[model samples]
Target chain A: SEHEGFLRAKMDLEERRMRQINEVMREWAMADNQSKNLPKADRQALNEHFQSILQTLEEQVSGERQRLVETHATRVIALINDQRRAALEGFLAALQADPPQAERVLLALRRYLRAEQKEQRHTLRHYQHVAAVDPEKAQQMRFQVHTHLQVIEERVNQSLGLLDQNPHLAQELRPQIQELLHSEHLGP
Target chain B: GEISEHEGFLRAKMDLEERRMRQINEVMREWAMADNQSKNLPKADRQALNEHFQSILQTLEEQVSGERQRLVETHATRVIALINDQRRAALEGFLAALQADPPQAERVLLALRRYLRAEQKEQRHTLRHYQHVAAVDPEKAQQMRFQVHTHLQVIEERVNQSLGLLDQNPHLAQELRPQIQELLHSEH
Candidate 1:
């Protein structure tokens, strides 16, 4: 019954769409014939009126859809990358405010690293979910996401290096001194 | 475990591609680990290599990101081109059929509309990738206006073409107009 209900709904929608298209076609057709019978002065004017109105009616769906393709296809990458920039800069600003130095900076780095990983996971989840509609774009989107993670590592390393040079950074060592972890996996 | 051959192949391929995406991250992580080696070196040696270390890292980071940016652009163009290819094929098919049989224009348009709707849905899903884009870059929204203008021009041509057919086939136009308006618009 559920399947039958779904089928009925699908058929109804299709029928409605077809009917709407037919209605527009018939109206345009009549307008075409009608314009010829009108006065010479009225002919072009009537045609323009129908053309304007019919274009609007035709675009009731299509004009709305064209934007979806017309957008700069590469924008999402820049947006995502900008997101990373803001986030990383925020983390940096957070640490810059913590003046106690060594403990604050190192712990902040670890916490920042945690946050970066969490952000990466969130990004990958949404990307994979949306990307399935186009598998090739899926891979490229994922590539861009992965590439940014490299930047994150660079940021962390840069922070670590700066802290090390300062002579007041790693005072809280031996605690976070682990070798490697489970982050390389991509799927369930 | 219970998937068909093609479905299973897709699953495996998608799964494999995701893992491949993560390799870049892993490489970054590995390099960061190696890059941290100097943190354990003597303070004097770190001081000695400070300028060189920073320079090398900066150069590498810049190069990696620069190269990745080009790839991002490349992938983006390819993605847009693929969508355009599919849309063009559908557009050509619809136009060709309309030219061959103008009376069947409504039926042909219905088919084109279905295809367009499907593409529109996919584009909506793609928008999820850039939901933050307009916020990050305010000008991104303005691009749509120019795009919609261009798109409307194309649709106007299609509309004009469709409307012209009515003059070429008046009997069919009037005949179908009676059936469609009666069949679809009549209310019980």
Candidate 2:
């Protein structure tokens, strides 16, 4: 039973692959002929579910990206603090054994302070760099998604769009498209 | 104490998004219901939205696909080469962190976890979005989900591969145990 999990899941995915591919071919064939496509009026009937899915997904992805910036900051701050604590312990121990080697201890203290200030500068730069990461990536993802959806939306419309253009073709194809979309047997 | 730190961290963010989304749904519904006769909503707007939406989805899919390719290759290299680049880098970094003035294993561990955690959350985050998409667009969402889930599984598996290597070098593993444990668990 335990061993059955991965293999079964694996097979399930492989089977779904062909099922959908076959359906794609069948649907495309039904939608096409010697020349032409469906009407533009019925575009939404075919595409609303797709748009809803994309918009919802984009919204979720955008939110996750926003949260990532914050959580990343939290982790960075934690790491810096971890380093700070490590440095502080070293400084304290040196202080614990000073006076006999006064010159060396003083040099060590001076070095520590200098290192820290420099690190603070580096940390600030890192933070500044990180703050912009989410927005830039988000914009790219948004643009990319928008452009692709634009192309495909127009594609679906243009494909079915056969002139805005087709008469009995619309009547015949409308029922078929609607039937396919609503059909439980096809299984979205 | 471990993964919970990031788990609750992300879930709270998701919770806030839920409230944000609810209000958004309400506003959009109000607009959709308003239904002006002179300037009414119809097939055009939705068709446009869907085209753009599909464009957006194609973009997101490209990124998800990018992650899966690199993740699998990275993991495969790790498993095949016996000890690969990034994982090796982490272990080496841990050693340097430990050998530092005050033993900074935590610095190495936290950094490792933060970056790895970020990507895992990204993959899982995207995976859930695809789960939603599958309801309406299963054919597309199918491979999207598989790629991401496999990416996550690889990381989870990566931790064990490292652990196995550590087993051969028991002395190193002894000190790396905490780091090992952190990497071994869930991140998102």
Candidate 3:
């Protein structure tokens, strides 16, 4: 069974992180205000100052991400608690079910995946949708979906390594999961 | 109950008096509007009359808001506080009333939207302008940016020193350093 509690928790955490990002965005807006119109020398100096600030903020962003990933996986593990082997099997089985809209099915799966160890699952529904309609919007949506999957898979893999369990969970998730890991190591 | 009824009668009397004042003001406005057709009037005389009427209107409004503030403060402090908190929005609303005819409100809103853009533009460029001050100044322009960069570095070091002090003292971490670091980190 899907962990409603975990999904809600995931959403709440995502909301909080987004709020934090918004707060930082305000700062970026402030810093960006200075970016234009400065003479080259001052611009260069401002860049350094803001660049340092950017690095520090980037770390916090990563930290938040780490917490989100860990928590997501923890929730999955909790649901899959040893005796709940059926639950894990059910989750994978759900993914295996041939989706009419492979991409749509993938997306629904991805949402759950994002909350569950941030796993990555590739289904053809997304590509099919893009193939069906507007290519530009489809491309943008594809990129969006790709980025999300990247974040989910990275954390899930890290979590699996820490938990030291069935790598198949990661393997079963390999298509999308491997793509994300590969993208990081080798540019797409 | 008697006191309340007496107060209500007094309020009604005040309302009537206010209506009379409004009627007198309305008549004055009609006369002022017709003054534009008064070919006998000198341009200076018309300008002076307009200025005087405008000044009176401003004075009257100030008095009304002040009176409302006083009454609410004395009789309904809690309600007054709530309104006080909403004064900015109220003022915006009141300003909109002056432009109530035709697309006047829309024009004012557009003007205001432009003003906000201008203000944002100013905030964005204030630092850049300061940098330009150095850019154009022959002597200062040469070293000004470097000097600012050095000053920034010094500030950074001082802040980091405070961070070091906090890191060394874990007991105080719960008190202040965490939040301070968090704020600093977020700004980055």
Candidate 4:
């Protein structure tokens, strides 16, 4: 009877803990969606909500199930990678369609790429615990993850590199754009 | 001896089922992570990868569902027997006092109900696995978002409808709130 009671108590605690974690993630998902596409006047409120929810997510999901953590990390990797690719594609498309707005679009692209770099760094740090247990697997994981990072870095360098090397394209751009294009960190 | 043997069989089956489910998560996450790095892939290679992923997901889903069903059947039998045993034990202990003090009958019933509820909740929590795949394309992403939003709306409506049924039993209604909220929070 005592052993059964103990097992029941443990199961009960685990179930409650999981439910709490799941609820928090769900709330974060809802808040994240709501924050997107908000009116300009509502941006402040959305930012406040996002900041709080993001904090809660960090707290609640930090030590949750390994499967959930893995899923979340992969989704972040996917989102960042997709956005990075989309930014490059969008920049090129804009360059062809509207040469006058190329500088603005390039600036936006630069900002997004930097943000993606930050996220990748964050993921690398966050998942070190998982990789630490198995050295061999960790090496493989690191290589795979580094490949993703390298690809992004290469794209950024290539875009910026082309901007400097292509004489006609450079001539068509604003002086500020040319300065940015010629700035450091363009090499792959 | 027979019951213990049956219990052992069920436990083993449950363990096997869990491993299979976890394998599904591992495989799917790997595919998803690889898909994120598909920028340089040739058109034919990308198409082949997509088809392979789609087929694998379909097969994984079917296999998981089948394993889950087998587990559910085994678990149902095991749980029904346990519930019967618990009920019998509770009644055997409570019957004399119950007859001696009629007012204590409700307390006994309440305890039995609480035990059953705990078992129900634990079982419900145990079977859910974290399975997620990020869309590799924009069209699919849009469709997934719409599907999830629609599912959320449906769940919200169902929860509201259930709350209406609970209006007559305020105590039960209060108890259901957290469970309902947890259900609504879970990703589809």
Candidate 5:
């Protein structure tokens, strides 16, 4: 009895949704294709062939939704796998590269720090003026000043550590690196 | 004998100033201590700055009592003296350190000058925002005016502080003449 009741409820819900979809499709077909202008005999034959258009329409829609779900799952998995492969390749290349990876990392670090500094300053100025109107509005104008400072410090330290492992490249960029460090007030 | 009397008067004035400074700092301490939880959070960053600005105005108002117009004239001299003796010296120390690295010093000064200009720009933008809103919304305009009033004294104090610094450091003042002039001309 319990199973029967559950099955009845499920059937009702499915039928209701399917009916709505069919009704919408039918109205759309009539408006777009002038299906209502079909001869009586042809209409009868079409009805007989399709039988319950609602059931057929619902099955096709259900299949499409399932198809989409399967596609989404496969695509996501493939994307993650591709990312992992690329990351491994990059690591391998870095380990084998000439001119040393430390120099490149240091250059990248400098560029990133400069870019972030400018961006943060712009964002801060925006908030400064916008928040001038209200306390609530001002409260929303949060800058990652401390966060950025810490991140840059960590990156610089890490880059320096790598430099120790490759002192040859370190000498080349030392002047530029020191200049950047001084400008940003990252002390000894 | 006149010089000795002047020294005595100056000593008495300095003593009076220390007391006044203590009271002002106490007021700021109280305000700062009251809003402890929201200090570091981004959601409250703007609110914290506004509170700092508001408390400065409030403290100033308290010191002057009800004789604002008259108090401003006399108090300005004391404020200027404080800035010259204290804040200006501090800024000089910062500039001196920057000067240690000549090339970096130029960039640092440029950045500082840009920041000062951007502050004036934002303040103007905020006031313009309120003026625009005032045209369509009387109730909101009234509230905005009150909010703006709270910030006016702080803004004036900042302007006065900058002027005091410039007066005491004539050489650096010349260097910053263009930006300083723009800041002074900015409408509250």
Candidate 6:
């Protein structure tokens, strides 16, 4: 009976949800064309109501399965990549900060670097499998990956720009090693 | 181990496609991906792309529904079993995955986001291609604008010349003078 009740509750929730969706869609359809041909004064009023309806409908639509997919996908990628970036940044910092560059620091950075690289490859492979199962979603994942890469690339580009502008800045010793040229000296 | 031809597999494809949509944003964030160029695309253009994409999705839905109906008719017993098996499991999994973030329906949103991205790239290419073509043909560019103008003028006119057996064989006494005068007065 509990299983039956649970199933019934699900069906009920689903049915209620669908009805809500149809209601919003019908409202959206109505509002979509409401401002087509009206006096300026009247149009403003109609537009206000139309926009309000649109906002509500948007919220409802967000409650639908589509929104769930987006949030989940975004969440997974965010957690994974953020963790990776943070870890990499930390390892890099730890390595550069240690005087004489301890073997532990170097080894830790190498390990993190390797692990991150492996995780990235694994993500890509899983993405490939994900793509096969759902080509559209695969394309989505690709777009997301491309997007994330763009952000990372932009930050890298910014850092490069800063470094290029101040080639000696990396040698400042407070942060970041100057990979540009073989600089063993701290900055002036 | 299920065969490709098995009825269960068809259901699986739908289930998977639905599942993949739920995790789009997470994956995007993980990679630190964001396209500034894409963000710069006009909102109106994005909306147009979304609308057209939704229209395309209608076709996909119709196709899928048709296929499902046919499967039901042709492979009634197996297909019913497959549907029952897939729907309950798929719905349960979906609810579980989405329950944590009930406010935002990640799955559907992710799918729609993918749809939006696909259409955006497609529209971008189309716009770029048009620009490329226009860049190669200045005449075509002018011609496109010409059709929208309020000006329509003709430079041709009937004229008499001194020529044997012509329309004005012997009556071509300064007949072109009037035409030249008219041409001077015209506003082309």
TM-score of 1: 0.35
Better of 2 and 3 by TM-score: 2
Candidate 3 residues A1-188, lDDT tens each?
44576577656755554444334434544554556676888766756664465345445545655576567667654643442344344445554565433353334434433444222222123322332333444434543443443444444455435323434444555487456434432111
The TM-scores of chain A alone, one per candidate, are: 0.42, 0.41, 0.34, 0.48, 0.35, 0.37
Best by DockQ: 1
Local accuracy of candidate 1 as per-residue lDDT tens digits, B118-177: 354334324332322332333453344333333434444554454455345676556555
- Model 6 regions more than 4 Å off: A1-63, A100-103, A118-188, B1-188
For residue B78, give model 1's deviation from the true position in Å.
3.7
Q: Give the least accurate 10-residue stretch of model 1 chain A, judged by summed lDDT.
A: A179-188
Per-residue lDDT of B48-136 in model 4, one digit per residue for the tens?
Answer: 87667556645545555556556556765766566556545544444343344333434544443443343343333332221111211
- Docking band of candidate 3: incorrect
lDDT of 1 by residue, A1-188 (tens): 43465456545644454445334444555665656567888766754664464345344434333443333223444545566566566556645674645555555555555555555665555444434333445444544554555566566557555545545344454234232123422111
* Highest-TM-score candidate: 1
Q: Ten consecutive residues with minimal summed lDDT in candidate 4 chain A?
A: A126-135
- The CAPRI class of candidate 4 is incorrect
CA lDDT, candidate 5, residue A110: 63
lDDT of 6 by residue, B1-188 (tens): 12444656568656744544334323443323222333567888655554554444334434444454554455535534544454345434433433444323344233323333333333233223222223333344334322211111010110111111122212321443344334324411
For candidate 5, the TM-score is 0.26
Extract clashing residue pairs from model 1. none
Q: Candidate 4 chain B: minimum summed lDDT over ten consecutive residues — where?
A: B127-136
Across A1-188, the per-residue lDDT of candidate 4 in tens digits comes to 43465456545645665555346445644654676687776866754564454344333433343445455557666766677677777666655554436566566556655655555445444334223233344444544554554564567657765555546655666465545433422222
Model 2: per-residue Cα lDDT over A30-58, one tens digit each: 33331235566564344443344444544
For each candidate in turn, the interface RMSD (Å) is 11.6, 18.0, 25.7, 15.1, 23.1, 19.6
| DockQ category of candidate 1 | incorrect
Q: What's the lDDT for candidate 3?
A: 0.44
lDDT of 4: 0.49
Tell me what TM-score chain A of model 5 achieves: 0.35
Residue pairs in candidate 5 whose N, alpha carbon or C atoms collide under 3 angstroms = A138-B46
